């Protein structure tokens, strides 16, 4: 077993219908990696479709500060195994849960830092003519601080997009309308709501009235004191017209964020 041979398994850090993710130490270099382990999907399934998007995202993407690094991938015993960078801070979703429990928070500044850092990640992905298509707190990881985009199973081309929608909570209406002419801006829409989650918003609606209200450009209720200036940035990021939303480029260079 390559897995057993090359790595020692330390602890399970993730699980879902997607499979499991394990904290492992690689024997050769003593370093910690996150190994995603998944049952090999049925041929011609959504699962195989998902799986394929991730393989070829790696093939195209190089290393980047704000994208979870991919090291290798292989298969054995009808399972697919992917060796990733380990982020010792866990996910932004875990962090928000902890805040909601311990009763700390992300200061307005820390929210600006998160937007900019994930913004930098997107700028890079978009520059390689790809889109992530599932930005949300659980797909943003933390290394201790650095924020990094993970889970590339929804990644597709800007030009010839094969679109499996991400989480309905973070989804731009135009994508639901089968409009794929400006996919990068769906990532921007989705980042904005991710930040609003970090800022302590009540859980985001999955559909119904409040879902629609948001896609009219209406921000969820925040529990804290944010400047009108940062507010408008977050607001225009969920503008119903995707062309009015900042590109990742315009984002990373925006006056409010820097720095
Ligand atoms: C579809 N699954 C994933 O993409 C995925 N899920 N996780 C949990 C990770 C991934 C990646 C993107 C494939 C790689 C990765 C890289 N690092 C972590 N780090 C991490 C560290 C600690 C924790 N936890 C702290 C809070 N807990 C007690 C649960 C473990 C969770 C994740 N997680 C992951």
Curated annotation (Swiss-Prot):
Changing residue 36 to R: Abolishes activity. GO terms for molecular function: ATP binding; magnesium ion binding; non-membrane spanning protein tyrosine kinase activity; protein tyrosine kinase activity. Keywords: ATP-binding, Cell cycle, Cell division, Kinase, Magnesium, Metal-binding, Mitosis, Nucleotide-binding, Nucleus, Phosphoprotein, Transferase, Tyrosine-protein kinase, Ubl conjugation. Phosphorylated during M and G1 phases. Also autophosphorylated. Mg(2+) 1 binds at residues 139, 151. GO terms for cellular component: cytoplasm; nucleolus; nucleoplasm; nucleus. Residues 7-257 form the Protein kinase domain. One of its GO terms (biological process) is microtubule cytoskeleton organization. It comes from the Eukaryota. Mg(2+) 2 binds at residues 50, 153. ATP binds at residues 13-21, 36. It is found in: Nucleus. The active site is at 134 (proton acceptor). The modification Phosphoserine is found at residues 15, 20. Its main location: nucleus. Acts as a negative regulator of entry into mitosis (G2 to M transition) by protecting the nucleus from cytoplasmically activated cyclin B1-complexed CDK1 before the onset of mitosis by mediating phosphorylation of CDK1 on 'Tyr-15'. Specifically phosphorylates and inactivates cyclin B1-complexed CDK1 reaching a maximum during G2 phase and a minimum as cells enter M phase. Phosphorylation of cyclin B1-CDK1 occurs exclusively on 'Tyr-15' and phosphorylation of monomeric CDK1 does not occur. Its activity increases during S and G2 phases and decreases at M phase when it is hyperphosphorylated. Belongs to the protein kinase superfamily. Ser/Thr protein kinase family. WEE1 subfamily. This is Wee1-like protein kinase. It comes from Homo sapiens (Human). The gene is WEE1. The chain holds residues 293 to 571 of 646 of the full protein.
